[PDB]
Amino acid sequence: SNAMFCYQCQETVGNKGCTQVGVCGKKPETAALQDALIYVTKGLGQIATRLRAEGKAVDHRIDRLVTGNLFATITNANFDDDILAERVRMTCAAKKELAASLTDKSGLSDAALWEASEKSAMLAKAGTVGVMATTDDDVRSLRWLITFGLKGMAAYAKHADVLGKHENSLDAFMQEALAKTLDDSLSVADLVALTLETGKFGVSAMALLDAANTGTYGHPEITKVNIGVGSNPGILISGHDLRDLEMLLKQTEGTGVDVYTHSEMLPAHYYPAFKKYAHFKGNYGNAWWKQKEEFESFNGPVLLTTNCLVPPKDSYKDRVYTTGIVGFTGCKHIPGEIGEHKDFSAIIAHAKTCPAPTEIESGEIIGGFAHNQVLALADKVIDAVKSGAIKKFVVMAGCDGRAKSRSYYTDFAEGLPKDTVILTAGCAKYRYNKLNLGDIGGIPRVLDAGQCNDSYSLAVIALKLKEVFGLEDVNDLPIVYNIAWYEQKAVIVLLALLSLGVKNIHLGPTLPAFLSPNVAKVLVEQFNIGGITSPQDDLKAFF
Ligand code: SF4
């Protein structure tokens, strides 16, 4: 018997699933608590949906619990059994009262009704509501593909909500989509249709977050980020939440403590607003998976606003602060999951007692090519395509990971002819944002759109070129898609691309284990998805 079963991220054991201990570090019991949190949440999804159907209101506070639950179960997000158990209790209470409000409490699934307050009971319930619970291969593949897509969506929705932006149609769809993954009467065609609709709402979440980020901190602009370090003690902030960064910087003003970014917080450097704080140093390190090394050589406090957090080493566990839905037993947690005021004076005091950062690289990188910035260079990018200056755009956005086969992406980018342009977003950029690919007619051969949620800009840019060149099919543009994925956020980006009609997508370093043969077949026949081989072989085939 398996102590657990999880295959939501690309590093899943044998690309089949984790049964004893997650490669990520997630323990059997933590994964069980996560399986219960999802079940009762979907259960809460059905209740909130029935209420809206009866014409009744559902306070937004409910939409926040749902998103918080989902996000907390994303890879490298929360490993704290105490916070998961309590969130399971919170969800049981919440759904128990919303359901009291219904008029016709009929047909409510088990997930909607079941409840427990004792951790031991939650672990038993989990043992029968996890993945395996769905027998039929094709319907399981689709139910979990949507659920993961819904995890990524929720995360983007929460960051938009943290900035005060939220749409009722988004929260309503999410909650209804979750309720449908428990419906035994949905055909496979229904689930395929729901997979595409999810992708659609995927585009909405990213568009909602794009607006929230840009509206509060300005449109990203061409920026030069220093990757070297200073001499003052500092705090390294990681993740994707920009709100926490505004508070951290306002509060670190005048204390002598500098602020650095890590992994997916690099893009914050691209915003005009944050450029007004003198103590906002550079971006330290690379993708998340090198944090055991980089968090250590940074010497100062490390703030994790979201995933990806790798189980800490004792050498720096004491200076690791989590916040929002992030969590690790033994690591100090700063309360706040809705952009409310956060008190970072403890982490700022802690930094004054730490050695300044130990430099590991010097120089700088260019970035800030989001939709608003590239559209302003449109005519210039278009004259380059027309003249043959830029023979091909290569989208390599996505998420990075530990797999050493990912050296592929570094060789791919390194081997591309010098008349091509790489478009990136997401921490997958680290595999090649530190090389020297030069430029084409003054346009960098690596255009960083931003975070993974900024794949949205790459999408906008493409639709724009299709309009300009008056093409009927977006796929007729000189764009090759060589995307890398890791967790559920990369999975909602993919479904967004599929809903937008983008085809010929190459996914790697491997294809999701939760994609069953027949389901994988449809992706191949309808959107022509493919995997990768050698960088030299694909540099020939892909073109
Ligand atoms: S999140 Fe990935 S590594 Fe961790 S248990 Fe899941 S599938 Fe395995």
What is the 3-state secondary structure of 196-211? HHHHHHHHHHHHHHHH
C-alpha to C-alpha distance for 384 and 177, rounded to whole angstroms = 43
Parallel, antiparallel, or unpaired for β 443-444 and 439-440? Answer: antiparallel
Do residues 360 and 297 make contact, with C-beta atoms less than 8 angstroms apart? yes
Residue 340 CB neighbours (<10 A): 10
Q: In the structure encoding, which two tokens stand for residue 49, read together?
A: 């949906």
Parallel, antiparallel, or unpaired for β 479-484 and 234-238? Answer: unpaired
C-alpha to C-alpha distance for 118 and 34, rounded to whole angstroms = 15
Q: Report the CATH number that the domain containing residue 443 is assigned in CATH.
A: 3.40.50.2030
C-alpha to C-alpha distance for 249 and 132, rounded to whole angstroms = 46
Do residues 27 and 19 make contact, with C-beta atoms less than 8 angstroms apart? no
C-alpha to C-alpha distance for 205 and 213, rounded to whole angstroms = 12
* Ligand 1 mutation target, pool 2, 8, 27, 70, most atoms within 8 A of CB: 8
C-alpha to C-alpha distance for 491 and 99, rounded to whole angstroms = 32
Q: In the structure encoding, which two tokens stand for residue 111, read together?
A: 């997930």
Using the atom order of ligand 1, give the atom closest to the CA of residue 10: 2
**Same-domain status, 233 and 213:** no
Helices vs strands, H then E, count in the chain: 19, 15
C-alpha to C-alpha distance for 517 and 25, rounded to whole angstroms = 28
**Same-domain status, 100 and 45:** yes
Give the E-state strand segments of 49-167 in sequence order.
none
Nearest to 532 by CA among 409, 428, 413, 410: 409
Residue having the nearest C-alpha atom to atom 7 of ligand 1: 7
- Angle of helix 488-499 relative to helix 137-162, nearest 10 degrees? 100
DSSP state, residue 514: T
Nearest to 451 by CA among 303, 220, 266, 260: 266
- From 346, 375, 404, give the residue that closes a domain: 375
Q: How far is CA 48 from CA 89, 194, 212, 217, 515, in A?
A: 17, 19, 25, 33, 29
Nearest to 151 by CA among 511, 530, 495, 498: 495
DSSP state, residue 225: E
Residue having the nearest C-alpha atom to atom 1 of ligand 1: 75
5 C-alpha vs ligand 1 centroid, how far in Å? 9
Coil, helix or strand at residue 288: helix
C-alpha to C-alpha distance for 130 and 133, rounded to whole angstroms = 6
**Same-domain status, 203 and 57:** no
Q: How far is CA 170 from CA 128, 176, 453, in A?
A: 30, 10, 16
Residue having the nearest C-alpha atom to atom 5 of ligand 1: 22
Residue having the nearest C-alpha atom to atom 2 of ligand 1: 9
Coil, helix or strand at residue 36: helix
Q: In the structure encoding, which two tokens stand for residue 256, read together?
A: 């002598």
Query: Per the annotation, does 404 bind a ligand?
Result: no
Coil, helix or strand at residue 476: helix
Nearest to 192 by CA among 249, 239, 145, 136: 145
Parallel, antiparallel, or unpaired for β 223-226 and 364-367? Answer: antiparallel
Burial of 480 (0-12, 13-18, 19+ CB in 10 A): buried
Q: In the structure encoding, which two tokens stand for residue 344, read together?
A: 């970072």
Parallel, antiparallel, or unpaired for β 258-262 and 234-238? Answer: parallel
144 C-alpha vs ligand 1 centroid, how far in Å? 14
Do residues 416 and 422 make contact, with C-beta atoms less than 8 angstroms apart? yes
Coil, helix or strand at residue 334: strand
Q: Report the CATH number that the domain containing residue 155 is assigned in CATH.
A: 1.20.1270.20
Nearest to 36 by CA among 141, 98, 124, 95: 124
Do residues 298 and 358 make contact, with C-beta atoms less than 8 angstroms apart? yes
Do residues 348 and 330 make contact, with C-beta atoms less than 8 angstroms apart? no
**Same-domain status, 341 and 425:** no
Paired with 415 in beta bridges are: none
Nearest to 267 by CA among 292, 310, 238: 238
Full domain range(s) for residue 213 = 140-223
Using the atom order of ligand 1, give the atom closest to the CA of residue 21: 5
C-alpha to C-alpha distance for 32 and 3, rounded to whole angstroms = 9
25 C-alpha vs ligand 1 centroid, how far in Å? 8
Do residues 506 and 530 make contact, with C-beta atoms less than 8 angstroms apart? yes
Sheet containing strand 320-323, strands side by side: 280-283, 258-262, 234-238, 302-304, 320-323, 333-334
The CB-side HSE value for 24 (13 A sphere, CA atoms) comes to: 31
What is the Cα 310 distance to its own chain's centre? 15
- Angle of helix 188-217 relative to helix 455-468, nearest 10 degrees? 100
Query: Per the annotation, does 308 bind a ligand?
Result: yes
**Same-domain status, 234 and 197:** no
Euclidean distance between the first and final Cα of the chain, in Å? Answer: 46
508 C-alpha vs ligand 1 centroid, how far in Å? 16
- From 106, 139, 172, give the residue that closes a domain: 139
Do residues 446 and 458 make contact, with C-beta atoms less than 8 angstroms apart? no
**Same-domain status, 98 and 213:** no
φ, ψ dihedrals at 367, nearest 5°:
-170, -175
**Same-domain status, 10 and 145:** no
68 C-alpha vs ligand 1 centroid, how far in Å? 19
Taking 3-state DSSP, the helix, strand and coil percentages for the chain, each rounded to the nearest 5, stand at: 50, 10, 40
How open is the CA angle 223-226-228, to the nearest 5 degrees? 175
* Ligand 1 mutation target, pool 4, 5, 9, most atoms within 8 A of CB: 9
Residue type, 109: S
Do residues 398 and 9 make contact, with C-beta atoms less than 8 angstroms apart? no
**Same-domain status, 533 and 384:** yes
Query: Per the annotation, does 399 bind a ligand?
Result: yes
Burial of 441 (0-12, 13-18, 19+ CB in 10 A): exposed
Burial of 472 (0-12, 13-18, 19+ CB in 10 A): exposed
Torsion from C-alpha of 437, 443, 444, 447, nearest 10 degrees: -130
Nearest to 342 by CA among 329, 351, 333, 355: 333
23 C-alpha vs ligand 1 centroid, how far in Å? 6
C-alpha to C-alpha distance for 12 and 291, rounded to whole angstroms = 20
17 C-alpha vs ligand 1 centroid, how far in Å? 7
Using the atom order of ligand 1, give the atom closest to the CA of residue 13: 8
**Same-domain status, 370 and 237:** yes
This structure's resolution (Å) is 2.6
C-alpha to C-alpha distance for 348 and 252, rounded to whole angstroms = 7
**Same-domain status, 323 and 426:** no
Total domains, the chain: 4
**Same-domain status, 538 and 440:** yes
φ, ψ dihedrals at 404, nearest 5°:
-75, -5
Query: Per the annotation, does 18 bind a ligand?
Result: yes
Q: In the structure encoding, which two tokens stand for residue 391, read together?
A: 């023979």
Residues 6+ apart with CB under 8 A from 468: 378, 382
Q: In the structure encoding, which two tokens stand for residue 235, read together?
A: 């705090």
Burial of 104 (0-12, 13-18, 19+ CB in 10 A): exposed
φ, ψ dihedrals at 448, nearest 5°:
-80, 115
Do residues 354 and 299 make contact, with C-beta atoms less than 8 angstroms apart? yes
Q: In the structure encoding, which two tokens stand for residue 276, read together?
A: 């007004």
Query: Per the annotation, does 489 bind a ligand?
Result: yes
Residue having the nearest C-alpha atom to atom 6 of ligand 1: 6
27 C-alpha vs ligand 1 centroid, how far in Å? 10
- From 343, 375, 407, give the residue that closes a domain: 375
Torsion from C-alpha of 28, 31, 32, 37, nearest 10 degrees: 170
Residues with CB under 6 Å of ligand 1 are: 6-9, 11-12, 18, 22-24, 26, 75
**Same-domain status, 339 and 386:** no
Neighbour-count burial for 72-102, b at 16+ CB within 10 Å, e otherwise: bbbbbbbbbbebbbebbbebbebbeebbeeb
